[PDB]
Amino acid sequence: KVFGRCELAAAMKRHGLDNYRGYSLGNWVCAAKFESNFNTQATNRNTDGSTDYGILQINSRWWCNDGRTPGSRNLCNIPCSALLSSDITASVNCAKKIVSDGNGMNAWVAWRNRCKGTDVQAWIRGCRL
Ligand SMILES: [Cl-]
Ligand SMILES: [Cl-]
Ligand SMILES: [Cl-]
Ligand SMILES: [Cl-]
Ligand SMILES: [Cl-]
Ligand SMILES: [Cl-]
Ligand SMILES: [Cl-]
Ligand SMILES: [Cl-]
Ligand code: NA
Ligand SMILES: [Ru+3]
């Protein structure tokens, strides 16, 4: 599924991401935009052999199992393919563990380089939330 901007905002809000660990909804939407372009099916191979999965580009090095990242962990206890679902529950649940892990949203390098410090509220502007 390719979400619309406000559609994804609503979904994230429903699943309790808005202000999770202090990060406002626009932060999450902005991260999704630059990680996946709002496409739940997005997959990208990393240099190290790990792969990033889904709307928030969650990495198999630590967070999900894909069977091909030696020798990574599966801290979200989920197959990586669950992260590509049209239903964002698994991605949101896993993202909550990630952002709680100590470096907050800096874990998402595209958030750090493209969202952090910017007018992230622009990303929920006009949404009926
Ligand atoms: Cl919704
Ligand atoms: Cl915001
Ligand atoms: Cl496997
Ligand atoms: Cl693996
Ligand atoms: Cl392994
Ligand atoms: Cl698995
Ligand atoms: Cl959803
Ligand atoms: Cl933080
Ligand atoms: Na893994
Ligand atoms: Ru839902």
Determine the Cα–Cα distance for residues 116 and 94; give it in Å rounded to an integer: 21
Which of 7, 48, 52, 119 is labelled catalytic?
52
What 3-state class would DSSP assign to 123?
helix
* CATH fold of 1-129: Lysozyme (1.10.530)
5-14 vs 25-36: helix crossing angle, rounded to 10: 130
Dmax (CA) of the chain: 44
Interior CA angle at 75 toward 72 and 80, to 5°?
75
Quick check: 94 and 73 in contact, CB under 8 A?
no
- Rg over alpha carbons for the chain, rounded to the nearest Å, is 14
Question: How crowded is residue 15: how many other Cβ atoms within 10 Å of its Cβ?
Answer: 18
The residue among 129, 71, 114, 63 whose CA lies nearest residue 91 is 63
Per domain, the residue ranges of the chain are 1-129
Amino acid at 74: N
DSSP state of 47: T
Ligand with the closest atom to the CA of 85: 7
Is 7 an annotated catalytic residue?
A: no
Residue 109 CA to ligand 2 center (angstroms) comes to 19
Asked whether residue 48 is marked as a ligand-binding residue, the answer is: no
Determine the Cα–Cα distance for residues 39 and 3; give it in Å rounded to an integer: 6
